[PDB]
Ligand binder design. Structure first.
Ligand SMILES: Nc1ncnc2c1ncn2[C@@H]1O[C@H](COP(=O)(O)OP(=O)(O)OP(=O)(O)O)[C@@H](O)[C@H]1O
Ligand SMILES: Clc1cc2[nH]ccc2cc1Br
Length: 327
């Protein structure tokens, strides 16, 4: 069957922590006062929650309220435990309160509000320096959560809030986040299609923090090459073919051979044979100002099939691409 795998960093953070730290099922939720919050406007709705802008009437501060849709208490306590564990961490969204919504009769998570800049404007206006600056900020949040034994599993642009005026970044939406336990087989239905790592696309369940580094690489490629998304699959199968058209099929077969993974036979008549492309192939007059040899080397070290070969968040922070960023 498949060869086992373990993270090359932060492998035993959870084994050496009190069981209360990662045993989210055993956690007793402390409930706040729902009357402290006045809902102002609906910001969005997904399969798992409705999101509102609200006012905390005890301090007149703006907050965001995520009212959870009917889902397993396992996912609810997991998100709460992760948010409480990471609270105060660099660039991690702050969970301000947990209240029972009187209408839905489900938990409502109250978060600090971030005055988020339009994503389309950010994507179209970020300069070379801003891309490096904000990528260093996201790495601080990822190294923190990884060092705390947690994988985010849904890194994507909509989950990175940026207040471009105050040069403030927050990593949000921890509903898919999970505690990393060496040897544990996880669900591969995580992350959004365009940001799914090859490990999820080939059904390899013993993955780790390095999944987030693939997702970060996908964001980087889309920003420096001005191609959103970078890997534009029609579905989860075409998603792997789109990756293989860039990284090539030889390295893909070496990856699956290393872990003794057998690809779904449905890939036999869609994967083809592709060579690895040089990153310069994606450079053109409209994105050249965002590309440098340091950007391409950094990208090359994130976008690797073998999850064990990708840079960790801390190694990424050491890369020459960030030497220009004021620290
Ligand atoms: N802490 C926050 N401060 C300000 N706005 C937030 C905060 N958290 C979420 N939002 C905003 O709430 C809105 C709705 O969120 P929601 O996650 O449902 O949709 P979304 O960002 O389009 O996500 P997805 O792409 O996953 O569907 C978004 O515009 C999001 O930026
Ligand atoms: Cl790190 C980062 C996160 C982001 N979220 C939306 C745009 C955007 C750009 C960068 Br660079």
């Amino acid at each position: 069957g498949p060869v086992p795998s373990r993270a090359r960093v932060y492998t035993d953070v959870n084994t050496h922590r009190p069981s209360e730290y990662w045993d989210y099922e055993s956690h007793v939720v402390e409930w706040g006062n729902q009357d402290d919050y006045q809902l102002v406007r609906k910001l969005g709705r997904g399969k798992y929650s409705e999101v509102f802008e609200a006012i905390n009437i005890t301090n007149n501060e703006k907050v965001v309220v995520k009212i959870l849709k009917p889902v397993a208490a396992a996912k609810i306590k997991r998100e709460i435990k992760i948010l409480e564990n990471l609270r105060g961490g660099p660039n991690i969204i702050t969970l301000a309160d947990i209240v029972k919504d009187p209408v839905s009769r489900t938990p409502a998570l109250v978060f600090e509000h971030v005055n988020n800049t339009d994503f389309k404007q950010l994507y179209q206006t970020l300069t070379d320096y801003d891309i490096r600056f904000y990528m260093y900020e996201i790495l601080k949040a990822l190294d923190y959560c990884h060092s705390m034994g947690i994988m985010h599993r849904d890194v994507k642009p909509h989950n990175v809030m940026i207040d471009h005026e105050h040069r403030k970044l927050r990593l949000i939406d921890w509903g898919l986040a999970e505690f990393y336990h060496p040897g544990q087989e996880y669900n591969v239905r995580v992350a959004s299609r365009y940001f799914k790592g090859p490990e999820l696309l080939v059904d390899y369940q013993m993955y780790d923090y390095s999944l987030d580094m693939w997702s970060l690489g996908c964001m980087l490629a889309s920003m420096i090459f001005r191609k959103e998304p970078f890997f534009h699959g029609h579905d989860n199968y075409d998603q792997l073919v789109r990756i293989a058209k860039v990284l090539g099929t030889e390295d893909l077969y070496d990856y699956i051979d290393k872990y003794n993974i057998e690809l779904d036979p449905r890939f036999n008549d869609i994967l083809g044979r592709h060579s690895r492309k040089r990153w310069e192939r994606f450079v053109h007059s409209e994105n050249q100002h965002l590309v440098s040899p340091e950007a391409l080397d950094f990208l090359d070290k994130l976008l690797r099939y073998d999850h064990q070969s990708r840079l960790t968040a801390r190694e990424a922070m050491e890369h020459p691409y960030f030497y220009t960023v004021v620290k």
